[PDB]
Design an enzyme around this catalytic site. Sequence first.
Site, PDB file in Angstrom:
ATOM      1  N   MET A  83      -0.851   0.253  13.659  1.00  0.00           N
ATOM      2  CA  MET A  83      -0.839  -1.128  13.189  1.00  0.00           C
ATOM      3  C   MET A  83      -0.306  -1.177  11.787  1.00  0.00           C
ATOM      4  O   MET A  83      -0.474  -0.247  10.999  1.00  0.00           O
ATOM      5  CB  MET A  83      -2.285  -1.743  13.221  1.00  0.00           C
ATOM      6  N   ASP A 133     -17.883 -10.934   0.938  1.00  0.00           N
ATOM      7  CA  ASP A 133     -17.645  -9.852   1.893  1.00  0.00           C
ATOM      8  C   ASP A 133     -17.818  -8.464   1.227  1.00  0.00           C
ATOM      9  O   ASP A 133     -17.136  -8.065   0.285  1.00  0.00           O
ATOM     10  CB  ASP A 133     -16.263  -9.976   2.508  1.00  0.00           C
ATOM     11  N   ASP A 136       0.843  -1.187   0.000  1.00  0.00           N
ATOM     12  CA  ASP A 136       0.000   0.000   0.000  1.00  0.00           C
ATOM     13  C   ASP A 136       0.883   1.242   0.000  1.00  0.00           C
ATOM     14  O   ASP A 136       0.587   2.216  -0.683  1.00  0.00           O
ATOM     15  CB  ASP A 136      -0.923   0.119   1.244  1.00  0.00           C
ATOM     16  N   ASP A 189     -11.234  -4.848  13.237  1.00  0.00           N
ATOM     17  CA  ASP A 189     -11.701  -4.212  12.005  1.00  0.00           C
ATOM     18  C   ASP A 189     -13.229  -4.223  11.964  1.00  0.00           C
ATOM     19  O   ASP A 189     -13.921  -5.227  12.076  1.00  0.00           O
ATOM     20  CB  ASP A 189     -11.202  -4.931  10.796  1.00  0.00           C
ATOM     21  N   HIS A 201     -16.282 -10.753   8.744  1.00  0.00           N
ATOM     22  CA  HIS A 201     -15.771 -12.131   8.627  1.00  0.00           C
ATOM     23  C   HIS A 201     -16.523 -13.139   9.482  1.00  0.00           C
ATOM     24  O   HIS A 201     -16.876 -14.246   9.054  1.00  0.00           O
ATOM     25  CB  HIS A 201     -14.329 -12.163   9.008  1.00  0.00           C
TER      26      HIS A 201
END
Lengths: 385, 385, 385, 385
Positions: free
Chosen positions: D86, D253, D55, D243, D218
């Site tokens: 994080m 998802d 990223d 999350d 999830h």
Amino acid sequence: YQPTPEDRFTFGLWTVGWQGRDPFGDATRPALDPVETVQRLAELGAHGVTFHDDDLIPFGSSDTERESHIKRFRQALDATGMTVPMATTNLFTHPVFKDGGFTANDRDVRRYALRKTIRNIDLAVELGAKTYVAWGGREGAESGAAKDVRVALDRMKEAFDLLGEYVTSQGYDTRFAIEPKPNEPRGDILLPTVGHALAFIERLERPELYGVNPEVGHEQMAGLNFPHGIAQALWAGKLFHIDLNGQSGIKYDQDLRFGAGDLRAAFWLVDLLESAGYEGPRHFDFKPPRTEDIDGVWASAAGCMRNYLILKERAAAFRADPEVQEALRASRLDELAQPTAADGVQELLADRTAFEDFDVDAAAARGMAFERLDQLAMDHLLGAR
Amino acid sequence: YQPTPEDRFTFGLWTVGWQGRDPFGDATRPALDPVETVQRLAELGAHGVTFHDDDLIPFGSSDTERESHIKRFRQALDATGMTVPMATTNLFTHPVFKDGGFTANDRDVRRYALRKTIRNIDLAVELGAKTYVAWGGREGAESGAAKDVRVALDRMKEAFDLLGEYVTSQGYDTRFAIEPKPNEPRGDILLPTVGHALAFIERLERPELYGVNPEVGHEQMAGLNFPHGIAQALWAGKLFHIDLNGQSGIKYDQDLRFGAGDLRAAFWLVDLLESAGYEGPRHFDFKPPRTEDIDGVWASAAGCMRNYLILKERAAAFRADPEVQEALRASRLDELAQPTAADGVQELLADRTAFEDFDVDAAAARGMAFERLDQLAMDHLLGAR
Amino acid sequence: YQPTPEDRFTFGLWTVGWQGRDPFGDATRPALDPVETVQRLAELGAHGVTFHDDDLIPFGSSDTERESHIKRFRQALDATGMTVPMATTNLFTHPVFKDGGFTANDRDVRRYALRKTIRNIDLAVELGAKTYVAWGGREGAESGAAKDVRVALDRMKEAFDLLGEYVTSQGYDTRFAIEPKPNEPRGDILLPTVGHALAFIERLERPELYGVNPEVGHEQMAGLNFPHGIAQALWAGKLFHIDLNGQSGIKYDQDLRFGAGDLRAAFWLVDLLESAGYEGPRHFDFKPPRTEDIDGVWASAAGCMRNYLILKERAAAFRADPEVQEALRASRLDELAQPTAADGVQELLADRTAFEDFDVDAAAARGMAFERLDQLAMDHLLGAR
Amino acid sequence: YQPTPEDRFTFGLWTVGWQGRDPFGDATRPALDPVETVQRLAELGAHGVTFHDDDLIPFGSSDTERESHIKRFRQALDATGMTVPMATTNLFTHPVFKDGGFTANDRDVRRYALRKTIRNIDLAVELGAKTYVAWGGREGAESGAAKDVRVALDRMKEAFDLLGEYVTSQGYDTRFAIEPKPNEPRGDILLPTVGHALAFIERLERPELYGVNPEVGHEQMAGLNFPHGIAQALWAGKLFHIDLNGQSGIKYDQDLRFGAGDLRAAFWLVDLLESAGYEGPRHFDFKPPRTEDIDGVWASAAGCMRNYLILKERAAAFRADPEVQEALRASRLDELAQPTAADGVQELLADRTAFEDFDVDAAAARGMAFERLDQLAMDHLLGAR
Ligand SMILES: OC[C@@H](O)[C@@H](O)/C(O)=N/O
Ligand SMILES: OC[C@@H](O)[C@@H](O)/C(O)=N/O
Ligand SMILES: OC[C@@H](O)[C@H](O)/C(O)=N/O
Ligand SMILES: OC[C@@H](O)[C@H](O)/C(O)=N/O
Ligand SMILES: [Mg+2]
Ligand SMILES: [Mg+2]
Ligand SMILES: [Mg+2]
Ligand SMILES: [Mg+2]
Ligand SMILES: [Mg+2]
Ligand SMILES: [Mg+2]
Ligand SMILES: [Mg+2]
Ligand SMILES: [Mg+2]
């Protein structure tokens, strides 16, 4: 279990051609040229191929380059003997169809949707397609106020009546098959199941031009029994096409090779297709798992047809077996075919045996023996018989 | 948020009356007498009650004891002003309907099914019911060869055409609402969703006599969006009745009090019922969790109506808000109501703005602003506005 | 494919003894005498039976009636050489359990539950049970504030800790196997999957006295891979016992016979347990459908054993096949067993071929050859190979 | 309800930076500069951003281009007071990962994965990350023989063990938080739920360096109760990070904004974390829909924060309400906190009121009063109270 062109197995260009991109990864395989796909498929023993306009002709191609594509494709078909039974429109991939195609909130995008479709209908009919599928994969929403459903359906009905008028005026012999799907890529897609699509077709101007194109994994993403739904498409006389693959549960649509996923449901769908005499192509809209290279692709693809022919054998050996013919009489599957009351209402009402003198409890205790029968099917699937 | 009889809230005798038995446990509450239920409900502010014949008159009651039951019930209704808008048949509980009622493999059990139903139709119409629901909860199978679906449907169509003929001959004003359900208690129930039921009604002899009775938790056991399905029942003109409750996921049907389970779906169903002017009873077919005593039952029940009226307020404040009326124009929900091509095919084809000169990419980049709109709905549900 | 005691196939009294009452249905069968069940399962080839306390001794018995049911049971086991490898407690049928046993909010119900379990640990030991199952069917909730779940994990641990103290103070050679289940009869159940039960165990005072008893249908209720779930439990050393059956996806727990439902997961399960070298019971926790009379009950208990034996034979042949061996090598299942970095973190870090000079493009181009390996697996299962 | 850094709300670069390509769709948005994202989230009230290695630094960068992207990122964080709590590694986008990172069957891919993770553990530490997330999206399978899963749990443990050795040899004050997910992008993923991740940790060499990072969507993919899953992880002391997002049941998802999807589970989640005293990041892992332009991207990232703050305020008022306190007492949530048997197994065993003279009928008659308590909870959430 060797596939021959007499078996009517067909594949999408985008199936074996899928490069491996998914919500979390990039392409794992190269782009496949439609000529190599036609050639390879014919050597695998397939009967035909299908296509979205954008598989064949890359989006926004001019008329030169459009011709150059169709022609090299039409040469690969002529030389192989491969047939194109069905074609369709990609009204989902380009960023412009993000809120749909036929039910897009923007009026401009909607009329366009239709121009893109009518353009391709003319290529399909030229190439010999008798079914034109429409998968409205962008027709829906992720939130409650983003789409008014009664109006979006008035729009969808208008977009289909518009197509029904144009085929009628051009005199084409093409019929449309509407492909339902519960979700993905939209949060909820309109006409989410075979049921919804059947009922919607009854409200189009010319219902006779329209059927469904069910897909195995689609109805199983709604936790539904696919053979049961197909039996209702058959009963209505609306199974125009069928899309075959595998799905292992209620989750994102996997598009596993056929016979993978739910294996007992795969056996009852073959059994029903065959016992009811479905004539159409046995089309595999599936996706070779991106773990594979190109050898895995034609392999996965050959496996689609193998499992069809193996399950076909086991379903015919099951229906043919005297002991299973006997097992069906034991479970009273012959009495289901019997009219409940051909004679009628007056007769039924008058009948004391049907209510007043009926021994409910004797009848309650007649076991159905359903399990003996289902283990006979199990041994025949497994080839223990 | 005080319920009055003008709100048309109705309950099943079997809802507040459910004793607590489930696949792993015994009764937790006593049996409720239908008179105490009528009385209590009327004091809670409900408008009416509904019933399965076997809630009212215990199975195999003679005509004496049958009369004694109906009469004490009819006195509780007269005295309270409570109304009975809908009634139905228990064709699922007795051991004799283990393979169905109308589609039972045994021909005897099937004609009986119908005698039991016609008998109750006469009590319903006498008591003022205008809808007669049919939930075929035993019509299906746990295995592939136990039921041939094309024939079981011919039977189901015959059983409904038989009922449609009898109402027509007796001149009753009663209409039938078919209640779809994906599964439970059968492994797969026939007509598993509102879609399937809508399409099936189009194949009955007199389609006009027939609509659906959707149930919130039912369509959500198929992971489906219930407001989307109801919009299609509305579009067809087939929402005759609606069953309201809560469901927290794809699992065994829970029958939670309404507004429990999926709360955002509860808000869009109220919003749609109200914006489309549904006239029918707001019926709660739900089950007070067996952890409760009788005080919890009338409490759970009052909560069903409270959450209806609270969500109703928030949906009207949402549609009424100028900023949300503006937000709908921003997302082009006014352009969805616009005909795509009133003018027609010739005109569309000729139009260069609709394909040839269409700037796809400008149009691709017009954001839908769907999220601003859905947070406005979120603040209005939550009463942050 | 006829079973014998060598196959260690077991069945709870509650499985073939299911009377068929479901949510909407009265019982379709007479209760079975326990002594009749150990005889009939012995004649079909079973290893032994299991029970819940209230399966063998009627709730409320009195404490000579209890004496009698135990003596009769004993004598029948001794007559046939039938064993009793496992026993469990019923903390879910009686209404005192409607909010839980070990985690009811009422303290005195957690005392009646703990004492009830210890009564049956004593009896189980005398009969020869070396595993004691604990399925908390009623532990959990329907609404959020009803259960503080961190304090419920405190009450769960307390009970299992006192039960461990109890059996070690007694010198009882018996171990516990916790059975997970995601829902039903509670909206959500505590310790809902295998992973959740395995994690809970590590926090107990004597982690060694506890393991897991997973069921096929329970993991399938959450759409999980039941073979993978069993592999993590054997990886952790905690598979103390198992309940075998079938389930058709995400819906109510059907408990179909083993083999039905997800047939390929049953294939993959038996390949795992036989390869694993698992040597505990093959216990069936199934319900013959309520459609079935007592003959059909026995055709379904025999179906369980038969399916497992076909499956063992097909899996055994798949793994012994030269073709499959070469394909497993081709999909580098052997490379998966070599350590990634036995050479420690330090030489890993200085291995320029692990990063700087790793070629990701020649590594990304390689096919995994899994479609060909999985089609050889499908071929074995269908007896095509 | 305006957020500020005091609320510790974070967002990965990958969330608002999603370009919108899905299975059937091309990207509808331009990539975002990272430096633009920390500015825009700082202006909306964020605490800081998180990232995957690829990223922040483009895959293949060269090792001055890398230098540059890190310096620019650093300077923007320093400019705004934005933190980096994080960081994680991307082991799922590039085709070398198509069969897994830590558990690919190819050994040399497990070496490139381990080395790639250590590169980003170093960088994460310098930037101030005290939690390192590991989501093995590609670890798992589509077919059964493809992955020996007991040997894959061996390869998983090896990697996490070497990563623990690595950070302790470095003196790195950082901990790991494993993220479970049941499926997508693999048919089934290893360590599929919270319970499965929690169980795996106990077998690692240094269980203390590892915890879990669960996501709302999830656990909802498997129909589990996400508040209960979070409570078992805080009960185990292992909730290292989280999350937050939304999901409409069992399907692909979606990663809707927090608040959307199952709104009451979001209510119950925030009641848990605020009551829990959880003080890690409130991290959003969501995707603005591909329908949305960049303004709509910011209306959805602001929606996340706003929903959490309404929810904190509604939950806080529910628990402070006298009414709710009395109802919790009435449902004996206080009795649930008293030990069942602090008096040991021996006085439990001799307590004749725990069994012999326990009255199960007066205990079974008591209502739990949960419907009334849950309706007070619904009242608070809708701002009716
Ligand atoms: O109580 C024992 C348990 O194994 C069983 O009856 C079950 O699986 N309930 O779902
Ligand atoms: O890789 C980090 C992980 O948190 C995230 O992107 C996700 O949730 N995948 O489903
Ligand atoms: O666009 C054609 C359509 O049939 C497509 O293959 C599909 O159903 N994907 O879900
Ligand atoms: O038998 C009437 C029917 O509406 C019933 O309440 C139902 O739907 N249970 O699932
Ligand atoms: Mg599809
Ligand atoms: Mg398709
Ligand atoms: Mg119902
Ligand atoms: Mg109903
Ligand atoms: Mg079990
Ligand atoms: Mg079970
Ligand atoms: Mg995440
Ligand atoms: Mg995610």
